[PDB]
Amino acid sequence: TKALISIDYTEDFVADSGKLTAGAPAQAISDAISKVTRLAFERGDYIFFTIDAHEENDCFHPESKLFPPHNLIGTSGRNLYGDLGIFYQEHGSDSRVFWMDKRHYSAFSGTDLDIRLRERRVSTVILTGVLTDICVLHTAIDAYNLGYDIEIVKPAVASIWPENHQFALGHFKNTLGAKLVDENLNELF
Amino acid sequence: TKALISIDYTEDFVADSGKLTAGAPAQAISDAISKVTRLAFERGDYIFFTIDAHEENDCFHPESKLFPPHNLIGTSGRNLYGDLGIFYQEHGSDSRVFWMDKRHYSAFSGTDLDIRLRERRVSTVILTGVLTDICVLHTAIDAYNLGYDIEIVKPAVASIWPENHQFALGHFKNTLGAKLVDENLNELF
Amino acid sequence: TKALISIDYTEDFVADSGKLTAGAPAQAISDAISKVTRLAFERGDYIFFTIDAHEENDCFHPESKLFPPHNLIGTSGRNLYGDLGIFYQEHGSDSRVFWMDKRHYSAFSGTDLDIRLRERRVSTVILTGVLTDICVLHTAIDAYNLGYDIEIVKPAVASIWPENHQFALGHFKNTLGAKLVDENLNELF
Amino acid sequence: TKALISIDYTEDFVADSGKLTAGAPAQAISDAISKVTRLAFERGDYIFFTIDAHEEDCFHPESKLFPPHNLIGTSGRNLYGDLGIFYQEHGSDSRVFWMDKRHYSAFSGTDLDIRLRERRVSTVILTGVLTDICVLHTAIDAYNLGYDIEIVKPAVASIWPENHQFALGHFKNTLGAKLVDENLNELF
Ligand SMILES: [Zn+2]
Ligand SMILES: [Zn+2]
Ligand SMILES: [Zn+2]
Ligand SMILES: [Zn+2]
């Protein structure tokens, strides 16, 4: 332990011209998300970038009927936003940094995330990224059911809707027993 | 083929003197939940009662630190509330009706629910019970990841928090692509 | 730390009049299996009895077409054989000893075994019971995929087919990287 | 309506110069494995190539049990024989998949179950190597996930004849699998 999970913080989710952008609140966490990721890496944590990898005209994916095309394979939409992308440029080849393609909201679903964590005997996951109430929430619930201790970096998660953001934070703390931390990985009270 | 999942509609979650009761809003759905369950049964659907089964002094359960003791094995707290309980006494021994003990919020986690459904080639699960934003939500997300079509019986789910109930219904429809239905199993628009 | 898994060592699998008995070879391990289980318990290990729980006229179970009825719920066939049964009568109520019903061959499939092990941060499982090439093999493979270290108690596993017993032992050592141990929990070289 | 799973039929497992080759018995199924895959595809079945993707990784417990094999970006991962030609022709088809795997089972840490569930597939047809290792593990996972199982007997192989026979017997008698030939006809 520990492992930091970086969820869908890409151009399509964050940039103003993004295909499924969260806009201003997503852009606002850029400094915090890059700071906390660098900090975790510096102290010896494993870093998992778990990124949507969709195909256009995938009729068998139930998500294709719910949202417009986003994070399409081979497009600039899948590029990491801001200084987080710079971090991946510098340290993406490191043995402790991973890139994982995902098709569901949860970073665990149909991936080998659990396997890689169990290989390294990680007991605690630290969650960052977007959206708080969709891919972060699904990931947190999967992590809970798989018996991981959970930390949520409050200033490094965001949603389009403030009320959905608040529901999710409340769910993490009160139902999942997750620890809410700041960008310095210190517990928030 | 379809299965109705009846989540935690017991004394401890519903009755006034219940140890972890949702109170009035949970009691309010008693007529709707019993009606829809009898209807699904009449239509030849499978019925799964997925019920919290906790032990006193379970130090290894993360839930024991978050909530007071509830649905303890061998106590009246685990008895089904209202006409739903009467239905179980009348039809519990039918080959299409199941009682399933669970320890996490999701009906799938550490149970053989997925196995029983796949044996019967079920492609659609119909969700009822409490709480909308906790055991129903977790069950719905697990169902989504496992590739089931989902129906939510809107008048047969309840939470102690109205805002959380609203978040969850929105999440089911917009994120999971679930169908919202009434107590007559007719789609709501 | 460690968990010992006791697989299907019941009257139906072991006794002369057992409905699906492995007969003499299964009876031959009675001393070793009871000894190793008592030893593991004395060393502070967790003990999981993972026992077939079948229903008669379960037409949805693929196993019902392959084998005659066995380990039927509520029958004497599910009673633990030999001194193992005495151990359970003596220590079944200890917080470290578990009884788990299962429907597939693997002790993990449709059960909460993985959950209970993760709760206790168990990294290694010790396998005992019958049959070596069926419920032991399936359980070992599931354990491997879930990232557990595996120990096999060679004198405390048995099959009705000696060639199959040999295949399984070889598979455990060479393919799964399991440690073969004796009834004193000492590694065999 | 069904899905054929093509397990690890690559240069490293099959060719004489292969890093973890099964040799002659693996080479012997080349004609049958290519024929049955083409037939399955022509019928409208989904085809999943599930292929070992290893890194020369200390956290992988398999690295202490076998020499390096099927390394990412190497020619050891190329499909052997006419099967490779089929992939050239139809690899970009929406019904044909290439899945990297790190465990023996094609299901473990992959999205195989998800893709099958999306397509409402109820039956998997297993081909490839080794009968008693990546085929056996895949079959056991399929069984636990509730799939009907077919095994193409002439399109599976192992290094050891006794292990091959154990596995075939296990599939038929324990998992309830149907044994079929290269024409996808049941064997009796
Ligand atoms: Zn997406
Ligand atoms: Zn509970
Ligand atoms: Zn059995
Ligand atoms: Zn390999």
mmCIF file with all atom_site columns, N, CA and C in Angstrom, chain B residues 10-27 68-70 81 130-131 159-161:
data_model
loop_
_atom_site.group_PDB
_atom_site.id
_atom_site.type_symbol
_atom_site.label_atom_id
_atom_site.label_alt_id
_atom_site.label_comp_id
_atom_site.label_asym_id
_atom_site.label_entity_id
_atom_site.label_seq_id
_atom_site.pdbx_PDB_ins_code
_atom_site.Cartn_x
_atom_site.Cartn_y
_atom_site.Cartn_z
_atom_site.occupancy
_atom_site.B_iso_or_equiv
_atom_site.pdbx_formal_charge
_atom_site.auth_seq_id
_atom_site.auth_comp_id
_atom_site.auth_asym_id
_atom_site.auth_atom_id
_atom_site.pdbx_PDB_model_num
ATOM 1  N N  . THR B 1 10  ? -37.574 -5.325 6.106  1.00 0.00 ? 10  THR B N  1
ATOM 2  C CA . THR B 1 10  ? -37.739 -6.021 7.381  1.00 0.00 ? 10  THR B CA 1
ATOM 3  C C  . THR B 1 10  ? -38.049 -5.071 8.544  1.00 0.00 ? 10  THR B C  1
ATOM 4  N N  . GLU B 1 11  ? -38.411 -5.655 9.689  1.00 0.00 ? 11  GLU B N  1
ATOM 5  C CA . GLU B 1 11  ? -38.774 -4.901 10.892 1.00 0.00 ? 11  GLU B CA 1
ATOM 6  C C  . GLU B 1 11  ? -37.735 -3.839 11.263 1.00 0.00 ? 11  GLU B C  1
ATOM 7  N N  . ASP B 1 12  ? -36.457 -4.224 11.252 1.00 0.00 ? 12  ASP B N  1
ATOM 8  C CA . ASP B 1 12  ? -35.386 -3.304 11.657 1.00 0.00 ? 12  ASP B CA 1
ATOM 9  C C  . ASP B 1 12  ? -35.203 -2.101 10.735 1.00 0.00 ? 12  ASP B C  1
ATOM 10 N N  . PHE B 1 13  ? -35.595 -2.240 9.469  1.00 0.00 ? 13  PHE B N  1
ATOM 11 C CA . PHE B 1 13  ? -35.495 -1.138 8.507  1.00 0.00 ? 13  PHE B CA 1
ATOM 12 C C  . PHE B 1 13  ? -36.792 -0.340 8.342  1.00 0.00 ? 13  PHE B C  1
ATOM 13 N N  . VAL B 1 14  ? -37.918 -0.922 8.755  1.00 0.00 ? 14  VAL B N  1
ATOM 14 C CA . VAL B 1 14  ? -39.234 -0.356 8.434  1.00 0.00 ? 14  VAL B CA 1
ATOM 15 C C  . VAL B 1 14  ? -40.086 0.015  9.656  1.00 0.00 ? 14  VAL B C  1
ATOM 16 N N  . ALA B 1 15  ? -40.212 -0.904 10.613 1.00 0.00 ? 15  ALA B N  1
ATOM 17 C CA . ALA B 1 15  ? -41.058 -0.682 11.791 1.00 0.00 ? 15  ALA B CA 1
ATOM 18 C C  . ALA B 1 15  ? -40.585 0.510  12.625 1.00 0.00 ? 15  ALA B C  1
ATOM 19 N N  . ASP B 1 16  ? -41.516 1.150  13.327 1.00 0.00 ? 16  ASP B N  1
ATOM 20 C CA . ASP B 1 16  ? -41.191 2.305  14.170 1.00 0.00 ? 16  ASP B CA 1
ATOM 21 C C  . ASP B 1 16  ? -40.115 2.026  15.214 1.00 0.00 ? 16  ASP B C  1
ATOM 22 N N  . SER B 1 17  ? -40.166 0.833  15.800 1.00 0.00 ? 17  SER B N  1
ATOM 23 C CA . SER B 1 17  ? -39.208 0.417  16.822 1.00 0.00 ? 17  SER B CA 1
ATOM 24 C C  . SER B 1 17  ? -38.006 -0.337 16.237 1.00 0.00 ? 17  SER B C  1
ATOM 25 N N  . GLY B 1 18  ? -37.885 -0.328 14.908 1.00 0.00 ? 18  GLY B N  1
ATOM 26 C CA . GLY B 1 18  ? -36.758 -0.968 14.223 1.00 0.00 ? 18  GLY B CA 1
ATOM 27 C C  . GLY B 1 18  ? -35.425 -0.348 14.599 1.00 0.00 ? 18  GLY B C  1
ATOM 28 N N  . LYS B 1 19  ? -34.399 -1.191 14.727 1.00 0.00 ? 19  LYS B N  1
ATOM 29 C CA . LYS B 1 19  ? -33.076 -0.764 15.205 1.00 0.00 ? 19  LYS B CA 1
ATOM 30 C C  . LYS B 1 19  ? -32.348 0.201  14.264 1.00 0.00 ? 19  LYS B C  1
ATOM 31 N N  . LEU B 1 20  ? -32.667 0.132  12.975 1.00 0.00 ? 20  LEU B N  1
ATOM 32 C CA . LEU B 1 20  ? -32.077 1.032  11.985 1.00 0.00 ? 20  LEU B CA 1
ATOM 33 C C  . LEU B 1 20  ? -33.164 1.487  11.014 1.00 0.00 ? 20  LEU B C  1
ATOM 34 N N  . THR B 1 21  ? -34.294 1.906  11.578 1.00 0.00 ? 21  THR B N  1
ATOM 35 C CA . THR B 1 21  ? -35.499 2.155  10.793 1.00 0.00 ? 21  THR B CA 1
ATOM 36 C C  . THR B 1 21  ? -35.436 3.409  9.928  1.00 0.00 ? 21  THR B C  1
ATOM 37 N N  . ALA B 1 22  ? -35.983 3.294  8.720  1.00 0.00 ? 22  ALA B N  1
ATOM 38 C CA . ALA B 1 22  ? -36.164 4.439  7.833  1.00 0.00 ? 22  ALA B CA 1
ATOM 39 C C  . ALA B 1 22  ? -37.483 5.147  8.157  1.00 0.00 ? 22  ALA B C  1
ATOM 40 N N  . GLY B 1 23  ? -38.309 4.503  8.982  1.00 0.00 ? 23  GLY B N  1
ATOM 41 C CA . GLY B 1 23  ? -39.522 5.117  9.515  1.00 0.00 ? 23  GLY B CA 1
ATOM 42 C C  . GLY B 1 23  ? -40.652 5.266  8.517  1.00 0.00 ? 23  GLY B C  1
ATOM 43 N N  . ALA B 1 24  ? -41.334 6.410  8.583  1.00 0.00 ? 24  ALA B N  1
ATOM 44 C CA . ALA B 1 24  ? -42.542 6.668  7.792  1.00 0.00 ? 24  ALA B CA 1
ATOM 45 C C  . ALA B 1 24  ? -42.432 6.448  6.267  1.00 0.00 ? 24  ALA B C  1
ATOM 46 N N  . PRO B 1 25  ? -41.360 6.956  5.613  1.00 0.00 ? 25  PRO B N  1
ATOM 47 C CA . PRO B 1 25  ? -41.279 6.736  4.156  1.00 0.00 ? 25  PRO B CA 1
ATOM 48 C C  . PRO B 1 25  ? -41.172 5.255  3.772  1.00 0.00 ? 25  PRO B C  1
ATOM 49 N N  . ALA B 1 26  ? -40.515 4.462  4.616  1.00 0.00 ? 26  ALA B N  1
ATOM 50 C CA . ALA B 1 26  ? -40.408 3.020  4.385  1.00 0.00 ? 26  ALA B CA 1
ATOM 51 C C  . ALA B 1 26  ? -41.750 2.334  4.626  1.00 0.00 ? 26  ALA B C  1
ATOM 52 N N  . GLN B 1 27  ? -42.444 2.741  5.687  1.00 0.00 ? 27  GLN B N  1
ATOM 53 C CA . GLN B 1 27  ? -43.780 2.222  5.979  1.00 0.00 ? 27  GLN B CA 1
ATOM 54 C C  . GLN B 1 27  ? -44.774 2.581  4.875  1.00 0.00 ? 27  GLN B C  1
ATOM 55 N N  . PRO B 1 68  ? -25.456 1.097  14.208 1.00 0.00 ? 68  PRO B N  1
ATOM 56 C CA . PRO B 1 68  ? -25.805 0.219  15.327 1.00 0.00 ? 68  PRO B CA 1
ATOM 57 C C  . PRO B 1 68  ? -26.232 -1.170 14.840 1.00 0.00 ? 68  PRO B C  1
ATOM 58 N N  . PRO B 1 69  ? -26.166 -2.191 15.721 1.00 0.00 ? 69  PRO B N  1
ATOM 59 C CA . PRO B 1 69  ? -26.589 -3.548 15.363 1.00 0.00 ? 69  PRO B CA 1
ATOM 60 C C  . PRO B 1 69  ? -28.006 -3.579 14.795 1.00 0.00 ? 69  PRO B C  1
ATOM 61 N N  . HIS B 1 70  ? -28.184 -4.308 13.695 1.00 0.00 ? 70  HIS B N  1
ATOM 62 C CA . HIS B 1 70  ? -29.471 -4.409 13.012 1.00 0.00 ? 70  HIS B CA 1
ATOM 63 C C  . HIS B 1 70  ? -29.543 -5.711 12.227 1.00 0.00 ? 70  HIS B C  1
ATOM 64 N N  . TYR B 1 81  ? -41.689 -7.058 6.721  1.00 0.00 ? 81  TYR B N  1
ATOM 65 C CA . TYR B 1 81  ? -42.719 -6.133 7.201  1.00 0.00 ? 81  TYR B CA 1
ATOM 66 C C  . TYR B 1 81  ? -43.972 -6.158 6.327  1.00 0.00 ? 81  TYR B C  1
ATOM 67 N N  . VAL B 1 130 ? -35.489 -1.237 0.457  1.00 0.00 ? 130 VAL B N  1
ATOM 68 C CA . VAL B 1 130 ? -34.855 -0.107 1.145  1.00 0.00 ? 130 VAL B CA 1
ATOM 69 C C  . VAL B 1 130 ? -33.366 -0.383 1.416  1.00 0.00 ? 130 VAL B C  1
ATOM 70 N N  . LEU B 1 131 ? -32.533 0.654  1.546  1.00 0.00 ? 131 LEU B N  1
ATOM 71 C CA . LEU B 1 131 ? -32.873 2.041  1.228  1.00 0.00 ? 131 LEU B CA 1
ATOM 72 C C  . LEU B 1 131 ? -32.501 2.319  -0.226 1.00 0.00 ? 131 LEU B C  1
ATOM 73 N N  . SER B 1 159 ? -36.274 5.771  0.943  1.00 0.00 ? 159 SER B N  1
ATOM 74 C CA . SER B 1 159 ? -35.130 6.148  1.758  1.00 0.00 ? 159 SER B CA 1
ATOM 75 C C  . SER B 1 159 ? -35.595 7.055  2.891  1.00 0.00 ? 159 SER B C  1
ATOM 76 N N  . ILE B 1 160 ? -34.788 7.151  3.942  1.00 0.00 ? 160 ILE B N  1
ATOM 77 C CA . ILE B 1 160 ? -35.068 8.090  5.030  1.00 0.00 ? 160 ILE B CA 1
ATOM 78 C C  . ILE B 1 160 ? -34.773 9.538  4.591  1.00 0.00 ? 160 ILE B C  1
ATOM 79 N N  . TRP B 1 161 ? -33.923 9.691  3.575  1.00 0.00 ? 161 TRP B N  1
ATOM 80 C CA . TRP B 1 161 ? -33.576 11.008 3.027  1.00 0.00 ? 161 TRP B CA 1
ATOM 81 C C  . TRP B 1 161 ? -34.181 11.209 1.634  1.00 0.00 ? 161 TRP B C  1
#
